[PDB]
């Protein structure tokens with residue numbers, strides 16, 4: 352299961368982050384690995400023009416701040432992205448040093464980190480393909496269907512219910528909020544979606 | 558640390574342009590590039606390819622299916638040049654890589670570097686349409702070693718299929734974009750040779 356990380360979680364300070372609080376700022380030094388006990392985070396980078404873009408989300412059981420543990424040519428790395436609390440989050444903080452020791456005495460901790468990193472690489476590579484091959488309408492639709500199969504998605508009698516804004520969809524797909532607003536109203540009249548303010552229901556997805 | 562991994566690996570060679578990994582296949586084999594270089598490609602449903610990135614000597618590939626317990630190959634791996642690769646079953650690697658953490662940290666370092674590069678590719682792709690992507694692909698190719706100086710700028714040799722694989726669109730879309738880019742005065746197409754103007 353995940354028992355092998357209990358030796359790790361016993362050596363963790365636990366912090367709380369309210370919604371929208373920034374946990375990691377892109378560009379900083381990397382000395383701390385995080386582990387989500389409760390809540391969820393948003394991974395944001397900045398685009399060619401400096402605009403925010405949402406890459407994805409991490410949830411319970413996920414490590415973050417781990418890419419800085421691995422040094423290209425053996426020297427300091429900086430935080431590759433911003434990690435912001437999406438809802439209220441209880442996270443466990445562990446030093447890179449204590450991790451190296453614990454991943455020294457038990458290699459299944461690296462194996463778990465590797466599984467999570469591999470899945471992130473698969474998802475981000477598909478995101479590359481979505482941006483290159485799909486126009487905005489197809490990207491909004493693929494985002495709704497994708498969020499329906501990720502955690503924090505809700506079973507609805509007519510399908511699934513996800514908690515998300517059109518501003519957030521626009522930052523995910525790479526367009527303005529007013530055009531994602533148009534696409535969402537068109538997809539609604541076509542029977543794919545319902546917008547509910549702070550929640551959207553995607554039909555035919557259960 | 559070093560020869561101990563390759564000592565339990567079969568040695569195989571792939572000539573240039575040969576497909577080593579087919580996307581969608583079961584993942585049961587881990588690879589290691591001893592010599593050469595490969596291209597990582599994905600496809601859409603219509604069969605259009607896009608180059609995700611490149612791997613070289615000392616890199617593992619075919620590793621993403623290794624951490625499952627039931628996974629299929631995430632992309633096509635094509636030999637860019639001739640490659641000697643070391644192939645090991647996921648099973649024998651898992652056996653040998655139980656306590657040996659100095660190799661798992663190596664795989665994680667290479668995966669972390671791939672994640673940083675691909676995330677940067679995501680940020681680059683967003684908000685640009687195909688015309689903007691073809692245009693920056695041409696300016697990028699103008700600074701490569703196989704490019705040639707032109708009195709009016711830079712001169713590159715590349716096909717519309719190769720541009721289409723860089724930007725992730727069809728060769729016929731690249732042709733339309735190129736005709737518009739000439740109408741903007743940025744490029745001039747001469748069959749298999751293209752001139753990009755005002756590049757510096």
Ligand SMILES: Nc1ncnc2c1ncn2[C@@H]1O[C@@H]2COP(=O)(O)O[C@H]2[C@H]1O
Nearest residue numbers: 415416417418419430431432471475676
């Ligand atoms: N493409 C991505 N997908 C998921 N998480 C990411 C991605 N890029 C960066 N991160 C996370 O964001 C963190 C920023 O700091 P680190 O580089 O230490 O570790 C990083 C990862 O936890």
Ligand SMILES: Nc1ncnc2c1ncn2[C@@H]1O[C@@H]2COP(=O)(O)O[C@H]2[C@H]1O
Nearest residue numbers: 476618619620621622630631632671675
């Ligand atoms: N974004 C990427 N960057 C570099 N290599 C990749 C990327 N995505 C997939 N790969 C490689 O392509 C392989 C395809 O099969 P695997 O998923 O087993 O392992 C994969 C990696 O070795």
Ligand SMILES: [Au+]
Nearest residue numbers: 487525526527
């Ligand atoms: Au747009």
